[PDB]
Amino acid sequence: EEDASQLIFPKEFETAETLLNSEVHMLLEHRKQQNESAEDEQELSEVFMKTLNYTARFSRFKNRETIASVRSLLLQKKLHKFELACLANLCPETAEESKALIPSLEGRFEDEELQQILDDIQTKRS
Amino acid sequence: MFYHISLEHEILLHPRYFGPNLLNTVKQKLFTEVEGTCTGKYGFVIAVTTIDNIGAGVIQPGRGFVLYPVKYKAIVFRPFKGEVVDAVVTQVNKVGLFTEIGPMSCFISRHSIPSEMEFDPNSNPPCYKTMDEDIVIQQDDEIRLKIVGTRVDKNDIFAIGSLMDDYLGLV
Amino acid sequence: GATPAYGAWSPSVGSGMTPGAAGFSPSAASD
Amino acid sequence: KRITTPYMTKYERARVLGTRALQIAMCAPVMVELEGETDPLLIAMKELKARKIPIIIRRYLPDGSYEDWGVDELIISD
Amino acid sequence: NMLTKETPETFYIGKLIICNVTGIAHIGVKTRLDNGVTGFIPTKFLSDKVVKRPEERVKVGMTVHCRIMKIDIEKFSADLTCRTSDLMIAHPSFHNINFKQAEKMMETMDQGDVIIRPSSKGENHLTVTWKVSDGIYQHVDVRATLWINSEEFEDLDEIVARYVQPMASFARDLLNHKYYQDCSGGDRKKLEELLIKTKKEKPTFIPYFICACKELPGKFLLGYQPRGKPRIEYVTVTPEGFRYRGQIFPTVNGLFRWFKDHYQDPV
């Protein structure tokens, strides 16, 4: 029954806080920077390294202010939290591609209304 | 898909750890307990960012071990069905494709792949192309997919991908 | 151990009463 | 706004002494100088005389509330 | 190579090869090697030719590690060297020691010479001892609860320069005081009679003295005689300054200046 396409999740996960690829990338980078110092400390595991090299290959923007701006310009809408992560991470070119990938956008909003958002997201990319 | 939620956990601390570094020892024990593990309820945990507070240690009767129900603010990665993410292809085999969604590796079979994407066993690098050889997909490429299923192999998550929907390839 | 903390001791001040007059030597300059 | 008695009952004193002695027996740091003794229970008794036990007692009230009372704060009976 | 399975190509010069000496023919110790090679240690490996066979250099019956300087697996030779060498003002010192024995090397250095040694209470702890006076030494047991971080463990050239050097200078400032004395380490029984014995020679003028105790280092004794009754008042020397009546002064002369204007009260 758990299918994110139809916007259903368990009660515990419904009150969660969405994270973007750049956000988690910078959080892990800062954690690595803190952990590398302060000698006599248990070094990072393979999980941390794999997550780092996985999120580093999808960092659409390095500046934290870019993350703040893209989340601020998106939260003003009426979309759910789940729609804040996938759409801001994939960064589709045209509204048709976004509507095809995410079935929730089908009929939820107009075509130009989503195309302008996608163009803004593309321009915000570094 | 990564999230930032508030979790709770309790750890017993042996009385040998009492002293001026009690809180530091509790934090160190917490760090090396709830990083990298996985559960069927919240999913796979990446790491811990910060700790909210330290509970009141209730010393057990007849035992020097004392438990601290600490509540930590850590991140978690619990992908669901139907989500679309961008991963990287690790290996190409005739049985199927191999990818790596962060702390996960999914897998797509040839049946999911359309018939246009044939095999290239003659070439040294295992790769799939079309008749015109215009589009090329190989390893170390940011190829998208759709999570159509989930599985937890005793705190080892392993989902399954799919390549039926349009606009799934090079961006 | 046989070498306890020495600077952690609290220096207790002694109390008393001495109703004396002001006839002592003056102060000096800190320079 | 604590309303329970400011004196330590015999039951609490016995239990605190026993728990502290058990902790010292399991290689825990002491909070008092040893004069040449080894038995953990006497160590705990000297500690209680010196008012240095790192334990606080939670007296539960019949209603459901509780009060946290520290060994070094309330008066010891014996 | 076919039988032993260990040719001289594998064993190189300089690399340490264990030669288990099990027996001796005439003088040397000819034993077996790890790879089934007959390791014959000549008299040169042990330095014994017309004397008792080498037992300390070559372990008889057991395996003795030595520098491998000969590949003679096929020839039933093992040129393993039995010798260990064959295999291969403000003076901060170091110590890679107990407490009773350490005191034997503290009375020679002058004031200001700081020495760092490990602790004897727990683990990952250090004790910093700095010369205070003749026989008085403060053993700062750093976990004198001096709270610090863990990054300082790598470089220890700043802790004594941030908490000991100014403190040592402040302590030494009192050593050169005009009215200074020791009285056999500043005992409480000997410092009281002096106050009553010096007042008779000058009832009008009330002088003062300064001394440091021996059982509790870091606590000076500043006594005075307001009347025919003695009184004692301790004082602590902090890293930044002093601690008299709860106040902390920046300079050493500040405490003296503030003390000469507050002892006139009836108390």
Side-chain angles (χ1 to χ4, degrees), chain A residues 1-32 34-38 41-42 44-63 66-77 79-126, chain B residues 1-40 42-70 72-123 125-132 134-153 156-171, chain C residues 1-5 7-8 11 14 16 19-23 25-26 28-29, chain D, chain E residues 8 14 23 25 28 36 39 42 54 61 78 90 92 102 112 118 122 135 144 161 166 168 171 185-186 203 207 212 217-218 223 226 228 230 239 241 246 250 254 266:
Chain A
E1 60 178 2
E2 300 295 349
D3 184 5
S5 301
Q6 60 182 359
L7 284 64
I8 183 60
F9 302 95
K11 71 294 289 173
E12 61 180 359
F13 182 85
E14 183 64 13
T15 59
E17 194 280 341
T18 57
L19 297 173
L20 302 178
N21 297 337
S22 300
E23 184 178 6
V24 299
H25 173 56
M26 200 25 45
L27 288 176
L28 297 174
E29 184 62 17
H30 190 12
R31 189 177 187 278
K32 169 57 181 181
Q34 292 179 337
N35 184 13
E36 58 182 4
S37 62
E41 183 64 14
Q42 188 274 343
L44 291 75
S45 64
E46 76 300 344
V47 175
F48 303 152
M49 320 327 317
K50 62 187 297 184
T51 52
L52 285 171
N53 49 62
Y54 171 79
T55 188
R57 299 183 63 177
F58 303 94
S59 177
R60 299 297 184 276
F61 28 84
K62 178 57 175 58
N63 179 14
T66 52
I67 309 181
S69 57
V70 298
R71 66 164 51 90
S72 60
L73 62 82
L74 200 167
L75 56 80
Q76 296 294 351
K77 303 180 294 183
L79 290 69
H80 297 63
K81 301 297 296 185
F82 174 82
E83 287 65 359
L84 181 142
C86 61
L87 306 181
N89 292 332
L90 299 180
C91 299
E93 299 179 358
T94 186
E96 189 281 341
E97 183 174 357
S98 60
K99 291 183 292 186
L101 295 176
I102 291 73
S104 180
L105 302 178
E106 297 293 356
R108 192 179 176 85
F109 286 94
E110 302 295 348
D111 302 331
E112 62 85 9
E113 184 177 0
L114 180 58
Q115 182 61 9
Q116 60 184 4
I117 298 168
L118 265 56
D119 298 330
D120 177 69
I121 293 169
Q122 292 292 354
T123 58
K124 289 291 183 299
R125 298 174 58 180
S126 62
Chain B
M1 60 168 21
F2 299 89
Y3 279 83
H4 203 182
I5 58 176
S6 303
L7 300 177
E8 64 57 23
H9 184 59
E10 60 287 12
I11 56 179
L12 288 66
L13 178 140
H14 194 270
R16 69 173 65 89
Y17 296 147
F18 299 160
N21 56 18
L22 178 61
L23 299 179
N24 180 21
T25 302
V26 179
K27 291 181 180 60
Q28 189 280 344
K29 295 291 291 184
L30 181 63
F31 297 152
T32 52
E33 155 32 58
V34 290
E35 291 177 10
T37 181
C38 178
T39 61
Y42 297 92
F44 188 92
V45 67
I46 304 300
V48 63
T49 60
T50 179
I51 302 172
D52 301 330
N53 62 86
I54 308 302
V58 188
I59 185 63
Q60 301 295 352
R63 300 174 60 267
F65 296 89
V66 57
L67 79 176
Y68 278 88
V70 65
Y72 56 89
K73 185 66 176 179
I75 59 176
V76 62
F77 180 83
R78 178 181 180 182
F80 290 84
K81 185 183 295 185
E83 300 182 356
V84 287
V85 298
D86 48 358
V88 63
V89 181
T90 59
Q91 183 177 2
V92 175
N93 299 333
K94 309 326 83 163
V95 65
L97 293 174
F98 300 150
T99 176
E100 184 64 14
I101 293 70
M104 206 132 69
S105 63
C106 300
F107 48 91
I108 299 81
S109 184
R110 181 63 174 85
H111 298 176
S112 298
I113 304 176
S115 301
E116 289 70 2
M117 210 46 72
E118 62 178 1
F119 304 94
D120 304 327
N122 59 334
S123 59
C127 297
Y128 299 157
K129 62 182 179 62
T130 60
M131 182 318 293
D132 185 69
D134 186 4
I135 188 176
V136 182
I137 183 173
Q138 69 293 356
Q139 296 75 350
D140 304 2
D141 186 2
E142 50 272 13
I143 301 299
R144 301 180 179 181
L145 46 68
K146 180 175 177 297
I147 290 73
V148 292
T150 180
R151 178 176 177 81
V152 182
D153 297 327
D156 304 320
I157 61 179
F158 287 99
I160 183 174
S162 58
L163 190 64
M164 296 84 173
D165 180 66
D166 55 357
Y167 299 94
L168 294 178
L170 181 144
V171 61
Chain C
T3 54
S25 60
Chain D
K1 47 95 154 163
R2 301 182 298 182
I3 59 176
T4 58
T5 182
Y7 277 132
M8 207 213 327
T9 55
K10 60 179 180 298
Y11 305 99
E12 301 170 349
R13 178 175 58 86
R15 188 171 180 181
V16 175
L17 285 173
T19 297
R20 182 62 180 180
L22 183 62
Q23 293 178 2
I24 317 316
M26 288 200 239
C27 184
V30 299
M31 329 312 323
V32 65
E33 280 304 11
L34 293 291
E35 301 292 357
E37 98 183 39
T38 88
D39 154 28
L41 205 170
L42 276 35
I43 301 176
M45 194 102 201
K46 184 181 293 186
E47 277 223 312
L48 180 62
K49 225 62 55 63
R51 304 176 63 86
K52 295 293 183 62
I53 291 57
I55 302 177
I56 59 184
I57 307 175
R58 179 174 290 184
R59 300 173 179 183
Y60 293 88
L61 285 66
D63 58 7
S65 180
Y66 58 92
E67 301 179 358
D68 260 297
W69 289 85
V71 171
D72 60 356
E73 159 283 353
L74 58 144
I75 316 81
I76 60 180
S77 172
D78 188 7

PDB file of all heavy atoms in Angstrom, chain B residues 105-123:
ATOM      1  N   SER B 105      21.772  -0.684  -3.397  1.00  0.00           N
ATOM      2  CA  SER B 105      21.984  -1.105  -4.771  1.00  0.00           C
ATOM      3  C   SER B 105      20.703  -1.747  -5.271  1.00  0.00           C
ATOM      4  O   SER B 105      20.231  -2.729  -4.694  1.00  0.00           O
ATOM      5  CB  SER B 105      23.155  -2.082  -4.886  1.00  0.00           C
ATOM      6  OG  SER B 105      22.887  -3.265  -4.157  1.00  0.00           O
ATOM      7  N   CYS B 106      20.144  -1.195  -6.342  1.00  0.00           N
ATOM      8  CA  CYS B 106      18.965  -1.764  -6.971  1.00  0.00           C
ATOM      9  C   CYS B 106      19.388  -2.567  -8.197  1.00  0.00           C
ATOM     10  O   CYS B 106      20.580  -2.776  -8.451  1.00  0.00           O
ATOM     11  CB  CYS B 106      17.960  -0.659  -7.306  1.00  0.00           C
ATOM     12  SG  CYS B 106      17.386   0.285  -5.868  1.00  0.00           S
ATOM     13  N   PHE B 107      18.410  -3.039  -8.967  1.00  0.00           N
ATOM     14  CA  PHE B 107      18.708  -3.890 -10.111  1.00  0.00           C
ATOM     15  C   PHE B 107      17.549  -3.883 -11.097  1.00  0.00           C
ATOM     16  O   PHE B 107      16.385  -3.976 -10.698  1.00  0.00           O
ATOM     17  CB  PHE B 107      19.032  -5.317  -9.656  1.00  0.00           C
ATOM     18  CG  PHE B 107      18.046  -5.884  -8.678  1.00  0.00           C
ATOM     19  CD1 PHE B 107      16.953  -6.608  -9.112  1.00  0.00           C
ATOM     20  CD2 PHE B 107      18.225  -5.697  -7.316  1.00  0.00           C
ATOM     21  CE1 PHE B 107      16.053  -7.130  -8.207  1.00  0.00           C
ATOM     22  CE2 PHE B 107      17.327  -6.218  -6.407  1.00  0.00           C
ATOM     23  CZ  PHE B 107      16.238  -6.934  -6.854  1.00  0.00           C
ATOM     24  N   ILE B 108      17.880  -3.751 -12.380  1.00  0.00           N
ATOM     25  CA  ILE B 108      16.907  -3.736 -13.465  1.00  0.00           C
ATOM     26  C   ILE B 108      17.260  -4.857 -14.431  1.00  0.00           C
ATOM     27  O   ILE B 108      18.426  -5.015 -14.810  1.00  0.00           O
ATOM     28  CB  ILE B 108      16.865  -2.374 -14.197  1.00  0.00           C
ATOM     29  CG1 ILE B 108      16.470  -1.226 -13.253  1.00  0.00           C
ATOM     30  CG2 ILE B 108      15.930  -2.424 -15.400  1.00  0.00           C
ATOM     31  CD1 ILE B 108      17.602  -0.674 -12.396  1.00  0.00           C
ATOM     32  N   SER B 109      16.258  -5.638 -14.821  1.00  0.00           N
ATOM     33  CA  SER B 109      16.464  -6.740 -15.748  1.00  0.00           C
ATOM     34  C   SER B 109      16.255  -6.279 -17.189  1.00  0.00           C
ATOM     35  O   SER B 109      15.789  -5.169 -17.456  1.00  0.00           O
ATOM     36  CB  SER B 109      15.521  -7.899 -15.424  1.00  0.00           C
ATOM     37  OG  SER B 109      15.769  -9.008 -16.271  1.00  0.00           O
ATOM     38  N   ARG B 110      16.617  -7.157 -18.126  1.00  0.00           N
ATOM     39  CA  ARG B 110      16.429  -6.853 -19.542  1.00  0.00           C
ATOM     40  C   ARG B 110      14.955  -6.728 -19.902  1.00  0.00           C
ATOM     41  O   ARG B 110      14.602  -5.962 -20.808  1.00  0.00           O
ATOM     42  CB  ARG B 110      17.101  -7.923 -20.403  1.00  0.00           C
ATOM     43  CG  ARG B 110      16.973  -7.683 -21.900  1.00  0.00           C
ATOM     44  CD  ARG B 110      17.663  -6.396 -22.321  1.00  0.00           C
ATOM     45  NE  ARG B 110      17.661  -6.226 -23.770  1.00  0.00           N
ATOM     46  CZ  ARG B 110      16.666  -5.687 -24.460  1.00  0.00           C
ATOM     47  NH1 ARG B 110      15.570  -5.246 -23.863  1.00  0.00           N
ATOM     48  NH2 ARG B 110      16.774  -5.585 -25.781  1.00  0.00           N
ATOM     49  N   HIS B 111      14.082  -7.471 -19.218  1.00  0.00           N
ATOM     50  CA  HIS B 111      12.653  -7.375 -19.502  1.00  0.00           C
ATOM     51  C   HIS B 111      12.126  -5.971 -19.231  1.00  0.00           C
ATOM     52  O   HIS B 111      11.305  -5.452 -19.996  1.00  0.00           O
ATOM     53  CB  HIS B 111      11.878  -8.415 -18.692  1.00  0.00           C
ATOM     54  CG  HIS B 111      12.241  -9.829 -19.024  1.00  0.00           C
ATOM     55  ND1 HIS B 111      11.721 -10.911 -18.346  1.00  0.00           N
ATOM     56  CD2 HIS B 111      13.061 -10.340 -19.972  1.00  0.00           C
ATOM     57  CE1 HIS B 111      12.207 -12.026 -18.860  1.00  0.00           C
ATOM     58  NE2 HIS B 111      13.025 -11.707 -19.847  1.00  0.00           N
ATOM     59  N   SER B 112      12.578  -5.343 -18.144  1.00  0.00           N
ATOM     60  CA  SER B 112      12.182  -3.964 -17.883  1.00  0.00           C
ATOM     61  C   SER B 112      12.706  -3.026 -18.962  1.00  0.00           C
ATOM     62  O   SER B 112      12.010  -2.092 -19.378  1.00  0.00           O
ATOM     63  CB  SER B 112      12.672  -3.528 -16.502  1.00  0.00           C
ATOM     64  OG  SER B 112      12.087  -4.319 -15.485  1.00  0.00           O
ATOM     65  N   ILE B 113      13.929  -3.256 -19.423  1.00  0.00           N
ATOM     66  CA  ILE B 113      14.516  -2.413 -20.472  1.00  0.00           C
ATOM     67  C   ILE B 113      13.763  -2.638 -21.777  1.00  0.00           C
ATOM     68  O   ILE B 113      13.433  -3.792 -22.107  1.00  0.00           O
ATOM     69  CB  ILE B 113      16.004  -2.732 -20.632  1.00  0.00           C
ATOM     70  CG1 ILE B 113      16.736  -2.558 -19.301  1.00  0.00           C
ATOM     71  CG2 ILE B 113      16.638  -1.840 -21.679  1.00  0.00           C
ATOM     72  CD1 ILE B 113      18.195  -2.940 -19.362  1.00  0.00           C
ATOM     73  N   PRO B 114      13.459  -1.590 -22.544  1.00  0.00           N
ATOM     74  CA  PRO B 114      12.811  -1.788 -23.847  1.00  0.00           C
ATOM     75  C   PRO B 114      13.687  -2.597 -24.794  1.00  0.00           C
ATOM     76  O   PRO B 114      14.885  -2.792 -24.583  1.00  0.00           O
ATOM     77  CB  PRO B 114      12.596  -0.360 -24.362  1.00  0.00           C
ATOM     78  CG  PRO B 114      12.612   0.496 -23.138  1.00  0.00           C
ATOM     79  CD  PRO B 114      13.562  -0.165 -22.185  1.00  0.00           C
ATOM     80  N   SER B 115      13.058  -3.068 -25.872  1.00  0.00           N
ATOM     81  CA  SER B 115      13.746  -3.899 -26.852  1.00  0.00           C
ATOM     82  C   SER B 115      14.736  -3.117 -27.705  1.00  0.00           C
ATOM     83  O   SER B 115      15.555  -3.735 -28.394  1.00  0.00           O
ATOM     84  CB  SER B 115      12.724  -4.589 -27.759  1.00  0.00           C
ATOM     85  OG  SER B 115      11.839  -5.398 -27.003  1.00  0.00           O
ATOM     86  N   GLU B 116      14.687  -1.782 -27.676  1.00  0.00           N
ATOM     87  CA  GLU B 116      15.614  -0.992 -28.479  1.00  0.00           C
ATOM     88  C   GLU B 116      17.038  -1.094 -27.952  1.00  0.00           C
ATOM     89  O   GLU B 116      17.997  -0.982 -28.725  1.00  0.00           O
ATOM     90  CB  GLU B 116      15.177   0.476 -28.516  1.00  0.00           C
ATOM     91  CG  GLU B 116      13.923   0.782 -29.340  1.00  0.00           C
ATOM     92  CD  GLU B 116      12.639   0.241 -28.729  1.00  0.00           C
ATOM     93  OE1 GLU B 116      12.692  -0.358 -27.635  1.00  0.00           O
ATOM     94  OE2 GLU B 116      11.570   0.424 -29.348  1.00  0.00           O
ATOM     95  N   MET B 117      17.193  -1.303 -26.648  1.00  0.00           N
ATOM     96  CA  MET B 117      18.497  -1.295 -25.990  1.00  0.00           C
ATOM     97  C   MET B 117      19.043  -2.720 -26.003  1.00  0.00           C
ATOM     98  O   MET B 117      18.759  -3.514 -25.103  1.00  0.00           O
ATOM     99  CB  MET B 117      18.354  -0.759 -24.570  1.00  0.00           C
ATOM    100  CG  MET B 117      19.565  -0.048 -24.017  1.00  0.00           C
ATOM    101  SD  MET B 117      20.277   1.112 -25.193  1.00  0.00           S
ATOM    102  CE  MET B 117      19.030   2.396 -25.171  1.00  0.00           C
ATOM    103  N   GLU B 118      19.840  -3.048 -27.018  1.00  0.00           N
ATOM    104  CA  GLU B 118      20.339  -4.403 -27.187  1.00  0.00           C
ATOM    105  C   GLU B 118      21.629  -4.604 -26.393  1.00  0.00           C
ATOM    106  O   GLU B 118      22.092  -3.721 -25.670  1.00  0.00           O
ATOM    107  CB  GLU B 118      20.556  -4.712 -28.666  1.00  0.00           C
ATOM    108  CG  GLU B 118      21.589  -3.824 -29.334  1.00  0.00           C
ATOM    109  CD  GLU B 118      21.810  -4.182 -30.789  1.00  0.00           C
ATOM    110  OE1 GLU B 118      21.136  -5.110 -31.283  1.00  0.00           O
ATOM    111  OE2 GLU B 118      22.657  -3.535 -31.439  1.00  0.00           O
ATOM    112  N   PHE B 119      22.219  -5.787 -26.534  1.00  0.00           N
ATOM    113  CA  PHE B 119      23.456  -6.146 -25.857  1.00  0.00           C
ATOM    114  C   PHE B 119      24.654  -5.887 -26.765  1.00  0.00           C
ATOM    115  O   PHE B 119      24.551  -5.921 -27.994  1.00  0.00           O
ATOM    116  CB  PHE B 119      23.444  -7.621 -25.443  1.00  0.00           C
ATOM    117  CG  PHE B 119      22.277  -8.007 -24.580  1.00  0.00           C
ATOM    118  CD1 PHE B 119      21.124  -8.528 -25.145  1.00  0.00           C
ATOM    119  CD2 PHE B 119      22.340  -7.880 -23.204  1.00  0.00           C
ATOM    120  CE1 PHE B 119      20.053  -8.897 -24.355  1.00  0.00           C
ATOM    121  CE2 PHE B 119      21.273  -8.246 -22.409  1.00  0.00           C
ATOM    122  CZ  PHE B 119      20.130  -8.757 -22.986  1.00  0.00           C
ATOM    123  N   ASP B 120      25.807  -5.647 -26.140  1.00  0.00           N
ATOM    124  CA  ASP B 120      27.082  -5.506 -26.847  1.00  0.00           C
ATOM    125  C   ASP B 120      28.141  -6.395 -26.201  1.00  0.00           C
ATOM    126  O   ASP B 120      29.113  -5.903 -25.619  1.00  0.00           O
ATOM    127  CB  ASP B 120      27.543  -4.048 -26.863  1.00  0.00           C
ATOM    128  CG  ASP B 120      26.509  -3.107 -27.453  1.00  0.00           C
ATOM    129  OD1 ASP B 120      25.769  -3.521 -28.368  1.00  0.00           O
ATOM    130  OD2 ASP B 120      26.437  -1.945 -27.000  1.00  0.00           O
ATOM    131  N   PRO B 121      27.982  -7.721 -26.278  1.00  0.00           N
ATOM    132  CA  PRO B 121      29.007  -8.602 -25.697  1.00  0.00           C
ATOM    133  C   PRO B 121      30.314  -8.590 -26.468  1.00  0.00           C
ATOM    134  O   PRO B 121      31.366  -8.876 -25.883  1.00  0.00           O
ATOM    135  CB  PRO B 121      28.346  -9.985 -25.733  1.00  0.00           C
ATOM    136  CG  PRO B 121      27.384  -9.903 -26.863  1.00  0.00           C
ATOM    137  CD  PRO B 121      26.883  -8.486 -26.896  1.00  0.00           C
ATOM    138  N   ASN B 122      30.280  -8.278 -27.767  1.00  0.00           N
ATOM    139  CA  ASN B 122      31.503  -8.280 -28.564  1.00  0.00           C
ATOM    140  C   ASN B 122      32.476  -7.203 -28.094  1.00  0.00           C
ATOM    141  O   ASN B 122      33.689  -7.436 -28.038  1.00  0.00           O
ATOM    142  CB  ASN B 122      31.165  -8.102 -30.045  1.00  0.00           C
ATOM    143  CG  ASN B 122      30.428  -6.807 -30.327  1.00  0.00           C
ATOM    144  OD1 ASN B 122      29.743  -6.268 -29.457  1.00  0.00           O
ATOM    145  ND2 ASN B 122      30.560  -6.304 -31.549  1.00  0.00           N
ATOM    146  N   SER B 123      31.966  -6.022 -27.756  1.00  0.00           N
ATOM    147  CA  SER B 123      32.821  -4.960 -27.250  1.00  0.00           C
ATOM    148  C   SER B 123      33.314  -5.295 -25.847  1.00  0.00           C
ATOM    149  O   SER B 123      32.605  -5.911 -25.045  1.00  0.00           O
ATOM    150  CB  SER B 123      32.072  -3.628 -27.240  1.00  0.00           C
ATOM    151  OG  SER B 123      30.907  -3.705 -26.439  1.00  0.00           O
TER     152      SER B 123
END
